Amino acid sequence: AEIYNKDGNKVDLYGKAVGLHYFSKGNGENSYGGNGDMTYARLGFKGETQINSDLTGYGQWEYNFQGNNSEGADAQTGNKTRLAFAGLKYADVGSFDYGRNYGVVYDALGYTDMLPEFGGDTAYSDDFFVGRVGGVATYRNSNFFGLVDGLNFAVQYLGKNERDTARRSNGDGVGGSISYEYEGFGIVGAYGAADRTNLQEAQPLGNGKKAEQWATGLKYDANNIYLAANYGETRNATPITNKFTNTSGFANKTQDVLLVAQYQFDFGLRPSIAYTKSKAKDVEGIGDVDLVNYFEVGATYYFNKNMSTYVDYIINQIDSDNKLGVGSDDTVAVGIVYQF
Amino acid sequence: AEIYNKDGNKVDLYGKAVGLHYFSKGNGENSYGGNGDMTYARLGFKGETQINSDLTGYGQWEYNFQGNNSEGADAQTGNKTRLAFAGLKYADVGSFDYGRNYGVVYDALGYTDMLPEFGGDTAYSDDFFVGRVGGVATYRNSNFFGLVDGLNFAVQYLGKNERDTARRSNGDGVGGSISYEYEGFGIVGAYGAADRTNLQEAQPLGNGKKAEQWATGLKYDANNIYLAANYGETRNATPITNKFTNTSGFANKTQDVLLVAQYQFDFGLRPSIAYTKSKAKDVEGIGDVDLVNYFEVGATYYFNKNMSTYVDYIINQIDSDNKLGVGSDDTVAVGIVYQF
Amino acid sequence: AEIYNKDGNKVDLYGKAVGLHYFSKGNGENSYGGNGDMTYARLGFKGETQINSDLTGYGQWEYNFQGNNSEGADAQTGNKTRLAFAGLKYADVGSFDYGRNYGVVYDALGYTDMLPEFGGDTAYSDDFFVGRVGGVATYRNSNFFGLVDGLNFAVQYLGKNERDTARRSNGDGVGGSISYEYEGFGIVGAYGAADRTNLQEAQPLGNGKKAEQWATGLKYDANNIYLAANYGETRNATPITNKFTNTSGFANKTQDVLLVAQYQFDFGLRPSIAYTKSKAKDVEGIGDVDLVNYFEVGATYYFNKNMSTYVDYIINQIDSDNKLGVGSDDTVAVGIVYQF
Amino acid sequence: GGDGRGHNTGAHSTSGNINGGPTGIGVSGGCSDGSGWSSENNPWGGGSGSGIHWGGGSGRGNGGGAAPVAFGFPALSTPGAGGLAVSISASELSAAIAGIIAKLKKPFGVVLSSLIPSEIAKDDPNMMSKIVTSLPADDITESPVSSLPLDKATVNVNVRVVDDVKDERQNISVVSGVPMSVPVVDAKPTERPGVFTASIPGAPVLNISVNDSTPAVQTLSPGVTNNTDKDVRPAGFTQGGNTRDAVIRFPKDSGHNAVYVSVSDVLSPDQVKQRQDEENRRQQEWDAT
Amino acid sequence: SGRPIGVVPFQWAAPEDIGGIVAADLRNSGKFNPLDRARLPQQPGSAQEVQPAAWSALGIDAVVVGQVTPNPDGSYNVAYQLVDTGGAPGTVLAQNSYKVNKQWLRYAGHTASDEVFEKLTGIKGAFRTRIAYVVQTNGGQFPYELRVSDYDGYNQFVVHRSPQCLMSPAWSPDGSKLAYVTFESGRSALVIQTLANGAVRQVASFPRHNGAPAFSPDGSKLAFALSKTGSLNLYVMDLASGQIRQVTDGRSNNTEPTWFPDSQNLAFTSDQAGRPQVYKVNINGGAPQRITWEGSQNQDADVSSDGKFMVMVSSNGGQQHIAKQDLATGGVQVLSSTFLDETPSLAPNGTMVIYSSSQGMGSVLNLVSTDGRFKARLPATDGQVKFPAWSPYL
């Protein structure tokens, strides 16, 4: 909500609480998502200020706190800062920001990530360009300098991050994304390329230095309807873990397909359907395998913008004989949300 | 304070800062509470929204940050999320919430927990129903559907939590609580029962599976006066630690007695008195013992609702020969509070 | 920004986001500051309330969240609470506060700490009186009871803190500070003395018990100009680390000199210059050495109070042959800030 | 880092509060008597508590923020950087060891334990672990340690706990039968309450901790056996070649009895064949002389 | 309904519409129906010009005419004549002429309103009287104002501004002082402020609410409610000595006193019977008697100046409205039909009641004639208006 809008400065504090639970057969080790209480609250602030008629500056920050944890040593587990960046928006040329923000590729993957709780599984966090990461400098242009309506393009540089684990580390990277919105229809295409650090190469899985991602997205949103289809291909970018070997690394090749179809009703209802799939190829010692292959069937009741309830039933089509130990069981999640 | 009350939605940001210190003889190992600086700040947001005349939705979240810690590796010690839940209140039938919230039994134990800093020692956190825990679904009825004034009853289900330690873990549980308020007087009764996980049974102390708590509370509040008396009995529910053995677990049986008497003055003063006791029975190898047995003598000056000062002197009656290493020393605490 | 100013109570939520980066030759091990992304967001609340015409109470809290970290196990690295205290300001006698706050000596060192990002290196955190620490009780007088204008004096007691490491620990301490502001010119003098804990003495470096700091500060601020010169001397107070030995401790003696000269322009610009030096003496096995010796050359564009950009180039004059492994390389930092 | 901005020295205050200062919290409910029947209480109040209760009450539930080894039973202590960790008890030594020492009173000795590196390394692969043993000094020494000059560094003893090499294993055992005498060292206290640091020449820092609270225990480790056969046998010529013992005394205002402690190295099998060899050569000598 | 009457525009654009003010005054009382200006048979500028037959034909037996002329000093002379057009056609029943400064032109109208109303009714006029009330404005520093205006809402001025809750202003019987509740100290206080100089007398600051002031008609006493004993009970202060006596003492609740004409009895609201009802008690002999038995709830009573009736807020079957109860019969007549009808106040002549309602979402006060015949909104204020109080004769 907008709490302070004065002196040519406006602040929108946005925060929410989510009472959530995941049900699954058994203890929940083999469940797609898990099992138990996953309640969480997020807090964040967005701020803008028109320095001039043609120039405004903005800053945004978001944090996530988990309530499922106890008050002991595990209180901080799952607690983090999602977004923390700043930037400036000129009148027409565009806008430039820096900090910890979503990667350009997520823009394409944004179309499918409309599900209540699950969705966007391919868009892993702390990954090169698919998810939200720290150390990015992004420039964005709206309507190509106002020349052509609906054509927004952006570019992003990724500063190297040398962390303890290859899963969370990266290096110098670049990327771009284009989006054309016409008459309700929407099309997008994004590409990102970066260099893997030595720690990443040292991992048993994964081979090569150029970690590459790219994606194409299509959608149509209107008349209380939302259709979306994202097809993405990557090399040495997707993380993979083997329970049998208890060893992790990255995928030599990956194809990902996401499809979403949601209808909305006047009386605060929104049924949703989602298909998903991700196939890894040229895996070291595992040939080709499917990481995720499932259907979604869910719904969301919107009492209002600030209050909502939702359910999601995940029909995991993954087979038990999978050569990586990926969960071959179904799952369900039920959530309630308040947000200001 | 209420910062945003618009569009049929209202937000009350509530946060406070507490400059606190604990004094005790010696280093403070044997002190009841401890010794040193215990300053802490809490931040939280509550939000409501009347979806309809008869239906409103609410969400609440609270976090605690400790200032006593340094800026090094120990910054996060004692930092946590206390409450994080949501729920809906219908006009008359009642209200239903889910998340991380107080257990039904705390309602009874709420009467005694009116002290400035100490108090409610029996109401441990991350315990089955006595303190605030994650994974509860609670329903509450006010005035029994509006039929009888002052009679509020509630019921609570507790989803299982499989954590690393038995102290913070639990299992499927159920509980209920009833409260009758008449002419200022108040009476309450709460009961909770759940199953202990295998990890809990494996502990050296404790025996049995049905972890049971129950409590009865009485009070009278009026004329600037507050009297309260809570008697609670539990089986395989209360945690216990042995310094001599350096081993922990739960109490086969426990009786707890709490008594509070506070007077309030027009000129922002509130002297308080509190008696407390907890006796464990059928302990493995220790027979029957007293965990806590002390008097309180304290006071609180209320400059206003948003600013307060307080003092509490804890006369620990515990003897040194106690067979668990519990502190047999007195203690004192002095605190100053700002809160919006 | 002031969000709630009602019922004789006023709340100023202040928070900011900083997109930052540090550039340096090589990986950045030898760089003065470091290298990579150092983006961070701070959130805090200040609150006041006039209980009476002559009496008001205030509470302040600040926290720092780092965005450079990932969402894995290292999310909390560098996350902390800077300030968390409370206190009361009487009409004329002065004001008294307690909690986690700046030490009296920082007041003198405040003059030089006007740089955009770097500066105030001598004012280490969790140190006795130079930086912000927990467990202080401070009293302050403004204009010596209103008798003499511009003469503010304060006194501070430091409760002992027994932490795991000597770097973050302390003991009982005392200190005082005086500040005379006349016609734009400003003069200050601060002194602090405390006892070192046994853990501190056990360290290989450092000798003696009385950890002593003191400082003298001069400044002139007017006409869009800010000049400042702080000279401080300490015994057994400054921390020091030896990479060659991989051993730390404190400095038997230290002299520190800080000089700042900043000019401001009407068109939102602020060039800055800073000289700095710190020399340790009577070091155990290293004789006399220079910890830091560098120039600053930087600038800051103030789009407005809520939005700013800045740059700082650190000319490290330290030589490579330094007998402690201190970085002998230059550095640069570029930052962008939004703040409400 | 620019924190100095502002940060005025002296009393800190803002400017322009909206309302005049209230006297206190005497009127809690509002600008009302608290009564509520007529329109004097809650004549302005609106939407008082429509929401259900959320954590009603203060909520400050609680507050912000060495089992002893029996005397005479050799056990492994892995060292730390701060030295070895040992925790003694007050309870006097069991019938077993008193028995042994009485029998032995009237160089020979009796084997307490036997060592097996194969096993000891399963848990302590580095082979850093030592073997500590402790007796109450008075049961060893004829002249009580109290009634002893502070100048004496070596008190005489009637028995000692010593490493021996017999039947192809190293073993810890109680020796006696000749004039013997061991180091006497004072135990400096430490930060911790009832926790001291004895330092015996040639061992690590032996930080002790008295405890007569926990019931005494006997630790059981796959390497260290408890040889039932307690016959008195002749002892090693090389006895003690990897052992350091000492009577340690506490400061007068502690009330802790003086304690004897031996700390023996765990020999590897090569070093045991070596000790065995030297022992056989010395037996040869003694046999010819 | 009401007596039909001809009210003629005054002979002069004129600085003020005196005829319109007289018509509006007479109408607000409920007792008169000024002839629609568009249907007047003539607009005589003088009594001589009145043609009685043309007014009697329309059922009008009296006609108000007058003249406004400017004076050399910029002031104005206002004159009125009341011409019989009934049994004494063309005769002037009453008349006057007098000099006022422009800023009293509206007062001039009320003066005429006062006389004709009395001439034709025999009742003293209350059109030159004033009302007091509390406004919660949208200003930040002093959101609470105790204000006074003319009875019809014109000529408003502020008597006191406060950053804290104000309640329940009350006029001294001479119209020179207002008692009221002020919370500027952070809790309740009862004070008397002198309008002429704004001086504030502190009346009571007991530990809890000090409220619902009422001046005795003779001016010697102030009634109010204190809960220091633990609950609201009635107390009276002798204004000469300042001594406080308690009038009610018991577990029943007694508050919102209003004085009877005798300055010895109070009517007030009590929950002794459950839902609020009106009780009567002597300020000396304390034993309250319930006097309201109609409806399901009765509260907020005001005793008439002759003591024959009171007005109050009554709840009958869900509907709360301003009602009038005859004090010697108990007969209740509902007067108002607005929503959230609250805080009525009677004119000293018993002919009009001012009260607050949902009108203007709280920002408007309303007048209703005590015959029930006329209802109107007052001019809208720049805030929320509560606690209206009708001055005594002024």
Residue numbers in the entry:
A (entry chain B), B (entry chain C), C (entry chain A): 1 to 340
D (entry chain D): 3 to 67, 85 to 125, 132 to 314
E (entry chain E): 33 to 44, 49 to 430
Published text:
The present work focuses on the group A endonuclease (DNase) colicin, ColE9, a member of the E group of colicins (ColE2‐E9), all of which use the same import machinery but target different nucleic acids in the cytoplasm (DNA, rRNA or tRNAs). At its N‐terminus is an 83 amino acid intrinsically unstructured translocation domain (IUTD) that houses three protein‐protein interaction epitopes (Housden et al, 2010); a 16‐residue TolB‐binding epitope (TBE) associates with the periplasmic protein TolB which is flanked by two OmpF‐binding sites (OBS1 and OBS2). Escherichia coli porins OmpF and OmpC are abundant trimeric β‐barrel outer membrane proteins with narrow channels running through them that taper to an eyelet, 7–8 Å at the narrowest point. Tol‐dependent colicins assemble a translocon at the cell surface that involves its periplasmic target along with the OM receptor and translocator which together establish the import pathway of the toxin.
The absence of BtuB in the partial translocon, most likely due to receptor dissociation during its deposition on grids, resulted in an improvement in map resolution, which varies from 3.7 to 6 Å (FSC). The position of TolB is rotated by ˜50° between the two structures and in the partial translocon is located closer to OmpF through a ˜8 Å upward movement along the axis of rotation. The positioning of TolB closer to OmpF in the partial translocon structure is stabilised by additional interactions between the periplasmic region of OmpF subunit 1 and the IUTD sequence immediately preceding the TBE.
